[PDB]
Amino acid sequence: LTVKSDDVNGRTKMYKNIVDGNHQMEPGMPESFNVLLKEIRSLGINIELED
Amino acid sequence: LKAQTKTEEFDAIKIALASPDMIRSWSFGEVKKPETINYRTFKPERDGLFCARIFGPVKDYECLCGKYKRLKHRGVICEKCGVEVTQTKVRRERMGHIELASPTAHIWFLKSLPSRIGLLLDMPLRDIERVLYFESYVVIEGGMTNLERQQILTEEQYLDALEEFGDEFDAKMGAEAIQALLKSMDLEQECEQLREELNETNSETKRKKLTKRIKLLEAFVQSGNKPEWMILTVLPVLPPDLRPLVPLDGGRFATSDLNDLYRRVINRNNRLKRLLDLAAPDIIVRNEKRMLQEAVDALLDNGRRGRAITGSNKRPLKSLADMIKGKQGRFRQNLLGKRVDYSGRSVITVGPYLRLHQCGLPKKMALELFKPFIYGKLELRGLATTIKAAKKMVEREEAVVWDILDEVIREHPVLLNRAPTLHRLGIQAFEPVLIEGKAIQLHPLVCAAYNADFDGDQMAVHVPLTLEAQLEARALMMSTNNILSPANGEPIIVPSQDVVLGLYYMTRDCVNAKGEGMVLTGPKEAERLYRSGLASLHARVKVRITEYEKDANGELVAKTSLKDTTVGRAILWMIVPKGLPYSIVNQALGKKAISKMLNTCYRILGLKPTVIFADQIMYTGFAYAARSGASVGIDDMVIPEKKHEIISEAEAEVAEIQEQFQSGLVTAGERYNKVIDIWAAANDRVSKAMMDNLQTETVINRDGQEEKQVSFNSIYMMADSGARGSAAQIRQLAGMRGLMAKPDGSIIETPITANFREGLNVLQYFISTHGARKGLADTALKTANSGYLTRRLVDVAQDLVVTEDDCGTHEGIMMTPVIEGGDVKEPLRDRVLGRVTAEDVLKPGTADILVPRNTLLHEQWCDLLEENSVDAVKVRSVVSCDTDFGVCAHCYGRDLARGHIINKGEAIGVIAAQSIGEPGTQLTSSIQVKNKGSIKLSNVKSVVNSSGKLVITSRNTELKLIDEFGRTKESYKVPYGAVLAKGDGEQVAGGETVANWDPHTMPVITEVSGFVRFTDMIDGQTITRQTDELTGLSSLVVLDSAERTAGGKDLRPALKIVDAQGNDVLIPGTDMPAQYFLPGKAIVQLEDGVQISSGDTLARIPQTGGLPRVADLFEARRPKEPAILAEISGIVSFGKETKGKRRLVITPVDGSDPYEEMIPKWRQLNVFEGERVERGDVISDGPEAPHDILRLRGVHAVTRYIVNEVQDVYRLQGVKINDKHIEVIVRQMLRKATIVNAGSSDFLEGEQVEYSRVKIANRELEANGKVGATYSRDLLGITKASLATESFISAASFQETTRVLTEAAVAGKRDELRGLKENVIVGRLIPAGTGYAYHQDRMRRRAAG
Amino acid sequence: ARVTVQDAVEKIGNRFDLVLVAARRARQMQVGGKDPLVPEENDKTTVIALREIEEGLIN
C-alpha cells in the first residue's frame, strides 16, 4: 500500500522491473508525502533529513 | 559487520526548523511570472511555473530552447537560459524559490485553540490578534517606558506616543514587529524567572502555565529551533511535474487549479517587493502582508477564515488540506486506497482432495494474474519472439505459454484472504494447483479457521511477488505451521464432523461382528479385509501392533503388543505414524478426542508427523465416511409412550394446580413458577426416557439371543462423536423443547407442549420466533462494533515491541487459581502456560527449589507444576518488566502460533490488540456442598457459643474445602453472622449445611458473655418501644439519628456490655471498651439485664458482564456508586448527620491522621467503627474504582484483579486466552503518571513513566544524588491514550491532522521514524521483524559510526 | 517431501531473519553469480536457500 499500487511511478518502475524478473527495490516516500514536506516548507518549519 | 563506506540506504527521520538557506540548497531558479501560457500561443512560459531555465527537460535529456535533443546530452545547459539536459523524471524533483519581502506570519498557529503564539510570547491571544490584523501597534524592544513588552496601542494613541516619546521607544504593528520580539525572546532569562514563579506563585491558574511554558521553552533548547524562523522570507516552489497542467480539449482548463492559486501568490509576491522599490505607505504594504497571507491560506485550507470563493463562482479556492486530511491522514492509508493487483476476488468451493499445503486456482484467473511473469520468462529464456507477440500468443491462447504458466506457478506459493476477516488467522498461505474452473478451491478443514462456511465467501487470493514474501508465505503464513492459536496453545483446527463420523465408524464397536475373533499381523491385510468386503470394520480382531515410542534420544523404541481391537482401528494404524502409540487410537474417536489426539502427536513426536498425519486423516476421514453407509433413520426417531404419559400427568397436574388457584392456596405468581416447576420435572423425566431409549435399544444377536451395544441410531452417533448433535438439540427434535424466553426477555411459565418433529401451532411458534430473531439481531450488530473495538485497541498498543530478551529483575506478579464459588473457575496451569517463573520457587518443602528463577515453563514444566503441591506461583509479568519502551522475551514467554522464545522484532503491541478484540464479536438460602472435604476457616474470628456451636463475627469470610486429598476445592463467601457446624479442622460430608444464615436478616452478635445494659439510650429520643400487640418479646429498637429530636441528633446510642456485677468489659483480643454504637432500623431482642452468650443473635436488621462491561474496564469509566476504598489502616469513628452528608472520621494508627471521608448516609455504609479497617477494605458497596485499586492497593494488584474479572467474561464465552496480551494493555493504560515530587520537571505532570524511568536512572547516578521528580501511577482510558499520541505520523492519521499540524510543528518534534505506523506511510522496513537487522545496520549508521 | 519448515525455524530462530538470509542467497542464484550446489528439483531459489539452511552450510 505504498511502493505497490500507491506510487503511480513506483509500480510502473516495478512493471518495467518485473517484466525482466528481479525483485530488488528502494524505500518509498509516496511523492505526495514530499508535498507534505513542501507545504510546511511553505510555512516555515522546514523538515530535513540530516546525515 | 562494519558501517558500510558506500551509500546503500539512508537513515532515521526527523522534523524541526531549518533554514531558507536550505531552500536555497534546492534552488534551481526563481519563478517570476505567474503566467504559464502566452495568451497567444499556448506555449509554456519561461520564467514561470513551467520555465526551462529554472526547471527544464520535458523530453528525456532535453534542452527546451531546442538545441540539444539527443540523449547524448547530460548536464550541458542552454547558456542563454540554463536548461540542464536531464531527466523529465528529475523534473518531479525540481524545487525553486521566489524572494519574498512580505513577512509571512503564522495565522494558523494563532487562531489555533492550542494558542501556539499565545503562550509562546506570554501575551494574551486576543491582543495578539489585534496586532496581526494590523489595527494595533504592539510595543517591541520596550520595557521601562510607560508601556511594557506585552501591550498594544491604538493608532492615534501611538501618534500621541510620538509626541510623548520621540526617543528611547518603538512600537510597530504586526508580524514585522513580532519578528523583532522573536529576535529578542531570551529563553533562559525567562527560564530563571519561570522557576522563580515556580517558587513564588502557588496557584494552578499561574503555575500550570508555568510547567508547560518552561517545558516548551527548553523544548526549543531540546531542538535548537529559534522562533525567528516563524517569519517566512523565501518561498519554496513545488516541482512542475507535481501540479499537473492539462487544459480541457476545446479551450478550457482541466488543470489542477493549484496553479491558478500559486498564480495569485506570485502576483502578490512581486507586488510587495515593488512596494519596497517605490516605498509605499506602511498601512498598505502591511495590507499586502495580509494579502500574501491569504494566498498562503487559500493554498492550505483556505486557512480557517472562511473559504473565499473563486472567480465569480460558487466554489471555494482549492484545498491541499483536503489533500492532507481526508481519512486516516492521506488516501492510500484511507479506506479505498489502492485495490490489490496480482490477486483475485473469487467465490469458493471444497475440493476434498487438496493436500494440506495447497489451494486451487482457476486457469482463466491464472493467465490474467501472471502475464508479466509470463513475459519475464518468455524473454529471459527467449521462447517468444517479442513481448508483443507474447501478448498475441495468449491472444491465441497458445499451448506454449500455458507451459510457461506452469513455470510461474508450480512452486510459486500464494497468500489467501477474505473480506469479513478481522483476525490474523484469516490470512494464510498455500501452494497453487491448476484447476480448470472459476472457483478457488481449498483444504476443507481450514475453512473453520477463516470461519468461512459456504454462504458466499469471496476470497481475494494474493500473490507474493518478491522473494521475501514468497518465503514469508511458506514460513509463518504457511497453513501447516500456524496449527496453533496465538490465543491458546491448542491445535486451531479440530476435525469438523463429516471426517469424524467416518472415523467414528472406523474405531467402532457393534455387537454383531463378521470376523469377530480372528487375528492379523498387519494393518495392511486389514485393508485387504474390509476394502474388499469379506469382513466388517467393527469385528473384534486380535492384531499384533508393533508400536513405537521415541523414548530414546530421538529413536522410536520397538515394543511388540497385541490388542483386542476393531478392524477400523487396525486400518487406523496405517494412518497413525509409528511414533504415536496405539493406545490413544484404541478409542471410539470423538470430536474432542481427535482434538487432543493431534495435539499429543505434536508435543510428543513433532510437527511434521502431525501435519502429514492430519493430511492422511482428512482423506480417510471422508473416505470411510462414504464407506459408512448408515446415515439417517426415521425408525430411530421413536417417541416413547412415556412422553405422552407424562404430558397426560403434566395436564392433570396443572389442571389441579389451577384448581388450587380457584381455591386460593397458591398465588398466580407462586403458581407461575410452579407451572415452571413441574413441567421442568416432567421434561427431565421424558428426557430420562428418550435418552436411555437412544442409548441401549440397539440389541442385536451375538452368542445368545440378543445383546446390547450403544445405539447404532445415527442421531446418537452425532451425540457420541459430539460432532453436531448435543443432548439439548436432541431434546428439541424428539422431545419437548422446554421453556422459552418471552418477547420481554423473561420466561413464559408454559413450555412448547409437544415436539417439532411432530406438531405444534403458530402461538407456540410466536414464542419460539422471539428466540430465533434474537440470535439474528445479535450477529447483525456485534460484528461492526468488534472492528471498532479493535480500532481503539490498535489505537493504544501498535508501537509496543519486544526489544530485549532478559532484563535484570526478579519482580513479577502472582498467578493463582481463581477458586470461586465451587471448584476453581480458572486453574493455575493455564495462566502459567507460556511464561517464566519470577524467582527460584520452592516446594511445600521449604528451601527446595522446584523451578530455578529463569526457566521457560512449557508443556512439561506445566505438567511439572501440576504434580507438585505448589498452588501459588509468582511469575514474571509483562508490566513488571524492567525493559523500558518494550518487554523482554522472558516477561512475555513463548505462546503464540509458535511455542518458542518471543523475538526481538516481534511487535506484541498489535497482536495483543487483535487477539483481545477477536472474541469481540462473541461477547454479549444455606451453603451445602455436594463434595467431600473439610472446613478451613480463613481470616475470621469464630467463637463458640451455647450448645457448643460456632458463629462468624465478620463479613470477610472464605470457606475452604481442604479435601482428604489436600487441594482447596470449594470456596464460599459467607455473610455477616452465621451458624457454623465445623471449626478449623473438621471434615465435611456430602450434602451438609456448614454455614446457615438468614438472607433477610443481618444479626449483630456479641463475642463475650454478660449482661446488657442500655446506656445513653432513652425511649423516645434514641430508641423506641416496639412491643406490638402481635409480639410478646420485650425489645428496644434503635432508630436512626435523623428522626430524633434537637438535643437528640447529637448522639450515637451506646450498648454497654457489662459483666456479672455491672462494669464495662474489656474485649479478649482487642483493648476496646464495650460500647456498641448501633445503626438505624436494628430490631433488638432483649430487655434490661439479659445475659447474652458468646456468639448470640442480639438484634435483627431486615434487608452487564459482557462486551459493554469490558468496554467500561478499558475506557476507565468511573461507576455510579463506587465501593469507597479505605485509604489507611486505622480505627474509625463517625460524625455529622443530615445536612448533605454523613462524615466518616478515620483515625490512622501509625500514619497521617487527617484521613477522613465525607460519605452520603444516602449511600449504604457497612463500616464497623469497632473494627480497624485496612488500606484495601471496602467501606460501602457496589462496583469499585480500579483507579484507587491501582494506587491504594497496588499496580500489580489491580493488573491481576481486572485480568481475573475480564477473563471471567471469557468464561461466559468459554474461550481461553492467555493474559499476557491483556496485561500489556494494562501496562499501556499506566504508561503516564502524575508526578508527586517537584524538583526536576513538575509537581503534577501527567508524564510518560518510562521517560521518567531513565530520568531517575541517571539521577541516582550521574550529576545528582536525588533531585529528580518521582511519580505516582496514573491510569487512563484507551480513547484518551489514543488522544495522547506523541509522534505526529500516527497522530495525523486518526486525530485531526490540522490539530497534529500545530501539535508537533511548533515543537519540531524530531521522531526518527521509530514506530511501525510511521515506517509504513514512508514505505520502509520497520526496525522490527525482517527489518530488524535491516534497521540494525541503519540505527548504528544513524548518529553513530 | 516438503510441507513444513519446522526445520528452518530451528536454525535461524527469529522467523524473519530467515526471510532475510535465504532471500539474498536466492538472488545470487538468480543472477548467474553462482549456481545451486545442493541439488534442486524445480524449486524456486527461495526454497533452495532453505535447503542450504537444513544442510547447514549456509545461514
UniProtKB/Swiss-Prot annotation, chain A:
Function: DNA-dependent RNA polymerase catalyzes the transcription of DNA into RNA using the four ribonucleoside triphosphates as substrates.
Subunit-level organization: The RNAP catalytic core consists of 2 alpha, 1 beta, 1 beta' and 1 omega subunit. When a sigma factor is associated with the core the holoenzyme is formed, which can initiate transcription.
Protein name per the record: DNA-directed RNA polymerase subunit beta
Family: Belongs to the RNA polymerase beta chain family.
Highest taxon above the source species: Bacteria
Organism: Escherichia coli O45:K1 (strain S88 / ExPEC)
Residues represented out of the complete protein: 1291 to 1341 of 1342
Swiss-Prot record, chain B:
Domain of life per record: Bacteria
Catalytic activity, reaction form: RNA(n) + a ribonucleoside 5'-triphosphate = RNA(n+1) + diphosphate
Gene Ontology terms describing biological process: DNA-templated transcription
Ligand binding (Zn(2+) 1): 63, 65, 78, 81
SUPFAM superfamilies, alphabetized: beta and beta-prime subunits of DNA dependent RNA-polymerase (SSF64484)
Cofactor note: Binds 1 Mg(2+) ion per subunit.
Subunit record text: The RNAP catalytic core consists of 2 alpha, 1 beta, 1 beta' and 1 omega subunit. When a sigma factor is associated with the core the holoenzyme is formed, which can initiate transcription.
Record-given protein name: DNA-directed RNA polymerase subunit beta'
Protein species of origin: Escherichia coli O157:H7
Lineage: Bacteria, Pseudomonadati, Pseudomonadota, Gammaproteobacteria, Enterobacterales
UniProtKB/Swiss-Prot annotation, chain C:
Protein's UniProt name: DNA-directed RNA polymerase subunit omega
Reactions catalysed, as given in the entry: RNA(n) + a ribonucleoside 5'-triphosphate = RNA(n+1) + diphosphate
Superkingdom, taxonomy of origin: Bacteria
Gene encoding the protein: rpoZ
Coiled-coil region list: none
Shown chain mapped onto the complete sequence: 2 to 60 of 91
GO cellular component: DNA-directed RNA polymerase complex
GO molecular function, one term: DNA binding
Taxonomic classification: Bacteria, Pseudomonadati, Pseudomonadota, Gammaproteobacteria, Enterobacterales
GO biological process, one term: DNA-templated transcription
